[PDB]
Amino acid sequence: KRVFITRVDEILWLLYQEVYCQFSTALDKKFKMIMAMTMFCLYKFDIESEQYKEAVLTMIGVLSESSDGVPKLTVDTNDDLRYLWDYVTTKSYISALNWFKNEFFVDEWNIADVVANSENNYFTMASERDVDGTFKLIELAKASKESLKIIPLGSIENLNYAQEEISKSKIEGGWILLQNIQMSLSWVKTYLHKHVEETKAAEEHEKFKMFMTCHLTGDKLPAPLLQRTDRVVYEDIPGILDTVKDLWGSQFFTGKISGVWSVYCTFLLSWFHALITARTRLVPHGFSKKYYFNDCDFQFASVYLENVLATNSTNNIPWAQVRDHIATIVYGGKIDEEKDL
Amino acid sequence: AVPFLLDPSSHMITVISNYYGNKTVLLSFLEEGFVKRLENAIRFGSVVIIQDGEFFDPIISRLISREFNHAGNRVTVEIGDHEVDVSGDFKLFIHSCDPSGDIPIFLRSRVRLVHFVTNKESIETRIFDITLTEENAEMQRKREDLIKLN
Amino acid sequence: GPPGSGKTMIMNNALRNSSLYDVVGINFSKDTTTEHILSALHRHTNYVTTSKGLTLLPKSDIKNLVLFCDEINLPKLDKYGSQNVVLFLRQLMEKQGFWKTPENKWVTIERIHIVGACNPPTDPGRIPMSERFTRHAAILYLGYPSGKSL
Amino acid sequence: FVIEKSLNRIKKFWKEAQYEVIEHSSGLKLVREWDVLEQACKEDLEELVSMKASNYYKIFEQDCLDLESKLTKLSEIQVNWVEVQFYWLDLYGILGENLDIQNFLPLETSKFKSLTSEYKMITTRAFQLDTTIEVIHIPNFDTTLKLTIDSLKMIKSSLSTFLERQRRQFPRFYFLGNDDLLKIIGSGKHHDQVSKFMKKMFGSIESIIFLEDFITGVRSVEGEVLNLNEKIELKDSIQAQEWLNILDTEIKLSVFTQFRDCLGQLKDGTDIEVVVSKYIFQAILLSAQVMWTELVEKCL
Amino acid sequence: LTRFVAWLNGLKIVQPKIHRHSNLSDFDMILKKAISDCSLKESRTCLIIDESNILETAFLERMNTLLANADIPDLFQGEEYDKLLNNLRNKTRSLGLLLDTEQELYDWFVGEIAKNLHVVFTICDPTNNKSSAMISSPALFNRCIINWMGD
Amino acid sequence: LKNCSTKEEARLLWAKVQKFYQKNDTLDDLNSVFISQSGYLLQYKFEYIGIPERLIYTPLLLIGFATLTDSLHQKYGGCFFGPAGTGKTETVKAFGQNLGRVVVVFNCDDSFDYQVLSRLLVGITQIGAWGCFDQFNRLDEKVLSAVSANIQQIQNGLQVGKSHITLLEEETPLSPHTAVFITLNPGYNGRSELPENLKKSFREFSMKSPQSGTIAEMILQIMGFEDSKSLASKIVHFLELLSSKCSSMNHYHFGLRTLKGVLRNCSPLISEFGEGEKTVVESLKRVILPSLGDTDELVFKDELSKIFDSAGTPLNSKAIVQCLKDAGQRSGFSMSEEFLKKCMQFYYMQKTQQALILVGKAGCGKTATWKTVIDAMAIFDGHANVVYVIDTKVLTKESLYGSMLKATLEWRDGLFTSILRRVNDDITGTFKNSRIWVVFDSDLDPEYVEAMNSVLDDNKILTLPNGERLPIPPNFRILFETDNLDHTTPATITRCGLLWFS
Numbered sequence A: 001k002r003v004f005i006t007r008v009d010e011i012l013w014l015l016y017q018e019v020y021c022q023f024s025t026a027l028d029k030k031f032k033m034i035m036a037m038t039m040f041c042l043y044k045f046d047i048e049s050e051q052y053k054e055a056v057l058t059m060i061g062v063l064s065e066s067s068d069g070v071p072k073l074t075v076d077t078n079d080d081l082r083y084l085w086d087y088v089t090t091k092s093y094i095s096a097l098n099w100f101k102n103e104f105f106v107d108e109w110n111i112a113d114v115v116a117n118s119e120n121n122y123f124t125m126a127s128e129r130d131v132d133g134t135f136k137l138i139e140l141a142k143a144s145k146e147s148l149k150i151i152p153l154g155s156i157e158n159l160n161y162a163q164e165e166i167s168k169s170k171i172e173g174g175w176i177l178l179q180n181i182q183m184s185l186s187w188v189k190t191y192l193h194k195h196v197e198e199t200k201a202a203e204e205h206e207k208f209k210m211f212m213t214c215h216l217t218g219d220k221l222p223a224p225l226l227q228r229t230d231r232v233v234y235e236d237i238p239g240i241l242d243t244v245k246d247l248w249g250s251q252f253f254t255g256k257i258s259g260v261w262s263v264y265c266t267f268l269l270s271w272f273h274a275l276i277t278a279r280t281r282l283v284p285h286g287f288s289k290k291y292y293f294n295d296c297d298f299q300f301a302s303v304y305l306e307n308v309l310a311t312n313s314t315n316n317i318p319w320a321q322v323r324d325h326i327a328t329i330v331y332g333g334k335i336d337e338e339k340d341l
Numbered sequence B: 001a002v003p004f005l006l007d008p009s010s011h012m013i014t015v016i017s018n019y020y021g022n023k024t025v026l027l028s029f030l031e032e033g034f035v036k037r038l039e040n041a042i043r044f045g046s047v048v049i050i051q052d053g054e055f056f057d058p059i060i061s062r063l064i065s066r067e068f069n070h071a072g073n074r075v076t077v078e079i080g081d082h083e084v085d086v087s088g089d090f091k092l093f094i095h096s097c098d099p100s101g102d103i104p105i106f107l108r109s110r111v112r113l114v115h116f117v118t119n120k121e122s123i124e125t126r127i128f129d130i131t132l133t134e135e136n137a138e139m140q141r142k143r144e145d146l147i148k149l150n
Numbered sequence C: 001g002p003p004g005s006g007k008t009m010i011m012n013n014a015l016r017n018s019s020l021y022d023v024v025g026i027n028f029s030k031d032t033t034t035e036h037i038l039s040a041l042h043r044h045t046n047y048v049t050t051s052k053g054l055t056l057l058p059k060s061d062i063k064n065l066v067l068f069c070d071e072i073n074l075p076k077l078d079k080y081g082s083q084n085v086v087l088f089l090r091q092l093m094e095k096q097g098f099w100k101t102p103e104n105k106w107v108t109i110e111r112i113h114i115v116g117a118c119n120p121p122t123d124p125g126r127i128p129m130s131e132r133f134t135r136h137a138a139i140l141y142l143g144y145p146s147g148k149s150l
Numbered sequence D: 001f002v003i004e005k006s007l008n009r010i011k012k013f014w015k016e017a018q019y020e021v022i023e024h025s026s027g028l029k030l031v032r033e034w035d036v037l038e039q040a041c042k043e044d045l046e047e048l049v050s051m052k053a054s055n056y057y058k059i060f061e062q063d064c065l066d067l068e069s070k071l072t073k074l075s076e077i078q079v080n081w082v083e084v085q086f087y088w089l090d091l092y093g094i095l096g097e098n099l100d101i102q103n104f105l106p107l108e109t110s111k112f113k114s115l116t117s118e119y120k121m122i123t124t125r126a127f128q129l130d131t132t133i134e135v136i137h138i139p140n141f142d143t144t145l146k147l148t149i150d151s152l153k154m155i156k157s158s159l160s161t162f163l164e165r166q167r168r169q170f171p172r173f174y175f176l177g178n179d180d181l182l183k184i185i186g187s188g189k190h191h192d193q194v195s196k197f198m199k200k201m202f203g204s205i206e207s208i209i210f211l212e213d214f215i216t217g218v219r220s221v222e223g224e225v226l227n228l229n230e231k232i233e234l235k236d237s238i239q240a241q242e243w244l245n246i247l248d249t250e251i252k253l254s255v256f257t258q259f260r261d262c263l264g265q266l267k268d269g270t271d272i273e274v275v276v277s278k279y280i281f282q283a284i285l286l287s288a289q290v291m292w293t294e295l296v297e298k299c300l
Numbered sequence E: 001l002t003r004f005v006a007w008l009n010g011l012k013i014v015q016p017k018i019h020r021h022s023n024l025s026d027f028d029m030i031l032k033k034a035i036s037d038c039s040l041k042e043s044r045t046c047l048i049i050d051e052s053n054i055l056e057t058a059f060l061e062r063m064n065t066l067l068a069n070a071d072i073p074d075l076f077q078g079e080e081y082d083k084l085l086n087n088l089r090n091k092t093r094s095l096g097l098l099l100d101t102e103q104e105l106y107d108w109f110v111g112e113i114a115k116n117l118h119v120v121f122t123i124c125d126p127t128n129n130k131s132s133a134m135i136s137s138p139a140l141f142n143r144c145i146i147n148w149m150g151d
Numbered sequence F: 001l002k003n004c005s006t007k008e009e010a011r012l013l014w015a016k017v018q019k020f021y022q023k024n025d026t027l028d029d030l031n032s033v034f035i036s037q038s039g040y041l042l043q044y045k046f047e048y049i050g051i052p053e054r055l056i057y058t059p060l061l062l063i064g065f066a067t068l069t070d071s072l073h074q075k076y077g078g079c080f081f082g083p084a085g086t087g088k089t090e091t092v093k094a095f096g097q098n099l100g101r102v103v104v105v106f107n108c109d110d111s112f113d114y115q116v117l118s119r120l121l122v123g124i125t126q127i128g129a130w131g132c133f134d135q136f137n138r139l140d141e142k143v144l145s146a147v148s149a150n151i152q153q154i155q156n157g158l159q160v161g162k163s164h165i166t167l168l169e170e171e172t173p174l175s176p177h178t179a180v181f182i183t184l185n186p187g188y189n190g191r192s193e194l195p196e197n198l199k200k201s202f203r204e205f206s207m208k209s210p211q212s213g214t215i216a217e218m219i220l221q222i223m224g225f226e227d228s229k230s231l232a233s234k235i236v237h238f239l240e241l242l243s244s245k246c247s248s249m250n251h252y253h254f255g256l257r258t259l260k261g262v263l264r265n266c267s268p269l270i271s272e273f274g275e276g277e278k279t280v281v282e283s284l285k286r287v288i289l290p291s292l293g294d295t296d297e298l299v300f301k302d303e304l305s306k307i308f309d310s311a312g313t314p315l316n317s318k319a320i321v322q323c324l325k326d327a328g329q330r331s332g333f334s335m336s337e338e339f340l341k342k343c344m345q346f347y348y349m350q351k352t353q354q355a356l357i358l359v360g361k362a363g364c365g366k367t368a369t370w371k372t373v374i375d376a377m378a379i380f381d382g383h384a385n386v387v388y389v390i391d392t393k394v395l396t397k398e399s400l401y402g403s404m405l406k407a408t409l410e411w412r413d414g415l416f417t418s419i420l421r422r423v424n425d426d427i428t429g430t431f432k433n434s435r436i437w438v439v440f441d442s443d444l445d446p447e448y449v450e451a452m453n454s455v456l457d458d459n460k461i462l463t464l465p466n467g468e469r470l471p472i473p474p475n476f477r478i479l480f481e482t483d484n485l486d487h488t489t490p491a492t493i494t495r496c497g498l499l500w501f502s
Ligand SMILES: Nc1ncnc2c1ncn2[C@@H]1O[C@H](COP(=O)(O)OP(=O)(O)OP(=O)(O)O)[C@@H](O)[C@H]1O
Pocket: C132, C135, F328, F332, F333, F334, F335, F336, F339, F360, F361, F362, F363, F364, F365, F366, F367, F368, F369, F482, F483
């Protein structure tokens, strides 16, 4: 219905633009590029000639390894194309994959754009364990000047406090977040499913908005509950230096009381954690398989450093035993393959 | 002919009940008291709907493949050893919850299979009806007022 | 031998004239059990207890008894390839006995003979029997009788 | 029409209702095979309900309404009666037999016997009517059974808090369970049967050695005998929890005693071969570990 | 058509009344009933079976044993054999022919079955794995006059 | 520590070793001794443990101890996954014994309900003992969810330090000494994982198995050390070279299981020759040689003489040869050199093991072989031989082993257990003066041998679903006569004596 607010030739193109503008936000980057290239093929194969189809099919077969041929580009079609072929001869894949996206000429909807545009009270942003969409909500709820409850789903008392805050916050109208809904899914199907599955009235639509944090890798959420709520995937990956500043910023909250050398050791631990986390994303190259690393490893490594520094003289000696301890107990615990060790 | 209502979207089992009123018994092949209550129902002449069609219980075959040993005064059917009298007014419906459920070939060749299953090809039917609703309100008005005034 | 090579007819003729070798016929299929074999034997056979031979199983008379176990290579083996009934028959030849598992005592067999009959293992659905079993038998081949003799 | 043909068979069936009755050890007679009659009752109730959709029954109804009103109360008494049966038969094997367990709980058994008498009255009187349907005409039967199962439930609730408090006194009893603890409490006078459970509530030791007056020590599952320093006294006015708690602390103190004694001997230049035949394994292991790390600290 | 032609021949008809819960024990009672009628009552029954009725392979194994011979030993095992023997003695002696030893009467029995029992298999779709197993079974295949009532 | 360069490696090594100190000024005797490792401390509890079995100290065992004390230092629950057979619970129990604690093990899903599990959790939460959840992945989803909730309450009460916690809606005190450990069998989508609620409260470890040189050296140190390092190196190199040159056969198993068997066979043979390399050579030729084929026997000989040549002529070369020839003559057999060789081989092998496996083609002569050896023994030793022959796959497991009835508890012994009962309880007849030969002549599979696996283990016990353990005497020996090992595990093969009739 949104498409309205050569007639066929216009409304069809604006429909392709509307489909990519709306459903791409609920998909990850890989499926975003799959949908962009595909839909582009479904639009261009019917309008243009067969030569255009044959050229695009042979270029996709050169990006893949199905069939590799280098036909004539077409005649005087160099302006329309030859750029993906130019990206092919240079063996560059990011520009060639983003060319199909630049072709849509669609402002890629940010999570702020979907939350502002859509008129619904339930949203679920599932993501990998690498990142968390909470920090995005911190700025987005502050920009909307709402509030942002962060109700952690912990024990039975946490569950009771969660349902109490839900039943009050919907009346007050403040935004709430439910971190890690996957672990309390058993409680979800009993209470939360029945609670938010059926819409009640406009009383909650005017003020109240609810958010749920899920994880892509993990248990499957119920189908009626997932269909009722809008879906987003927070896929914003921060930089290495940015993660270093984020880890360094957290250190002076609690404070350091051991000594000045412990500060230097903590700085080294922050760089080490950011570099392992940087190597984590690269699964085929680098780490043999994908290992998930949390801040608990940062905590255990920090406590081991304070324990060894509190009982040892200021000489350069403990660097012999700290390294093995980290690579075998703190971080080498999850790793099973010796190559990654 | 026994209708077989294939609607995953449960709804038919309500419209039927809203039509026939209080005399709609609802049954199931998985309710293990089924056989005696079904026997009882046909003796009473109730309307019956049976849930979970992707199951069948061959004893019911004589209701499906119409057969009734004729009597003079009455009309009787062996639902097992139970030589049951048919109260005339009886009506059997079967329902089923999913097309991935297999239909035994015995049923599938006697019973009137009907699908209420939502079909994507409703996009093809409906989006034109909305395209014209935003293209020409007056002609889509004429398209309906012609036949209804007629 | 192939299907219809007078495999049974030859046995039946040879032994019908004879007064010494009576016949039991046991036609196997996909899932025959050893209990079926013992149930077949029960009508013709008798059991006697002896300390020296534990439970002797003679036949219920003075003759000899031939178990014609037809289609012996069809019983469906388990996934490891073990077809337990062929092993049981191996036990009957090689060991002259078997274990009686409700009693947990050994049974020695007295005068019972085994005859197999089979259609070649290359035919559809046939199972290659264990060599450890087949090693005990004098295998013969029969073929169709040349057309002219027919 | 067929309405009559069905009511006839229903009434025919219900004028033949018999219950299998068999008497257990004490005077009371238990009833066997509840499910047949109950299932028939429920089946006939659904048929009587379904008889309301017919058209040829309007004038033909009143009789069937009386029949329905009878069968509904029949099922009402059915449920409560089977529940009473089950709960009494369960509490009987716990309280109706032992003398020590009822000496510990005089009130609940004092009530149990008073319940058993009335139950005997009702059951005998009910069985001798010779028609299971006519039982509903016996006065005060539904309310009787209602208050009887209420009293049984109260007794059974009481029967569990005493055990839970006994578990709170000695937390090893959590491993045992209800049945074994009941035998330990009843058989506390005899004192030998507790030894079988000792492997469960300890895990290391196997049996307890006696000298018919006191506990000299205990032996493990391997066969090694442990001798206690302080012998445990036994008297008539004692509970299992008391001497069991004293035993629990005493074995730990005796382990420490032989450990410091072993360490003192090993410090006094002794052979390991003479010590092994005299002290337990655990003491010589720890004393050897302490002396080994002590000598290797200066060796470093 | 089979019921019609049975009616023409004055055969009794049998159709097993099996459903979602009938088991081997029940199908065993059916067959013992049928065989007793065919022999003791001489009733000449056309036993009509459809593939839908053999919802497990044990029924098919039994039908192989039946058509391969003219009996199921398991149906007449133990004390039931002795009872059966008594009935047959009585039966034979009721007809005035006298046989003494068990073998003679059992041969008579089996021959009477072999002439008084007619089994008819309908099969709706040959390509079903069960149907394929019934066609491929040698005990069935080497007895049944296969006829195609195709389409 | 002696081989370290300076004090730096010595202190690095000493930090990892468990140090047992004592407090002199304690006056709190039960709390006197404490254990220091890598800087963390742990109080020794004076709980009686009896005489428990001790694991071989290996580097990976100390790494597992370091992971446990590291998690306990921060009051975190311990848990480690890995393939089965690496000693997860044995490590946890050994960790408890080292501190004088009896770890209560909870066996799960083996028709194990949830009521009694909660009763054990409340009791261990009061006593302050240590609980280990052995193989936690095999659980039902409803029971696993409720138990995981209870574990979450326990660990959160430990981390925060609450004295009283609400478990089973029951208020109960919490002693600070309780700890919970979770061992995880390997999954089927990969390695099994924990539920999401428990991930932020436990510390996962990758537990596997060790290599071979170190353990080989340690065992050689036990048996008599002379040249422990060189002998271990030569044995490992010899096994690697055998795996290198010998044909790729299915039943070939040259892993650590095989070398532990070779060393356990070397132990009683040292008493015959001495703590030299010659004993190792003879053990290898007793164990490995009968399992190799004609094509591989010469490979074995060549590589053996290559890496180390020790002796030339064996003992017991003639009285047994005579008795065998007499036995074969009584049977009317021709005493071929191959038959003689295999008879003597089998005769020697059966001296130190009870589970024999004889493999070959149908008609090889294996049954004649073992019966002739039995008769020869009956002559030479003067002991009797009782033989039972069980064509086991004709029987069901239930007809062989026992079972439970419909509701009655009465136990059907099953054939193999009933005969074992007779072999032990009888105490009338010369079974103690007899060799008892129970032959399982059939193709063997995993399911049946799994139901009796503890007989192949060093336990030498038949374990039964009935909960009873039947210790087997030395008189009892078992022969799996068969023609193939395709569906047999290496775990079983390495506990048996294998004889390949080439
Ligand atoms: N020592 C011997 N001297 C002469 N002939 C022998 C000797 N040993 C075996 N044979 C012959 O080889 C035959 C086959 O060996 P055997 O009977 O032991 O079969 P098997 O190896 O046990 O095979 P299966 O696996 O089939 O049981 C014997 O029947 C015998 O005739």
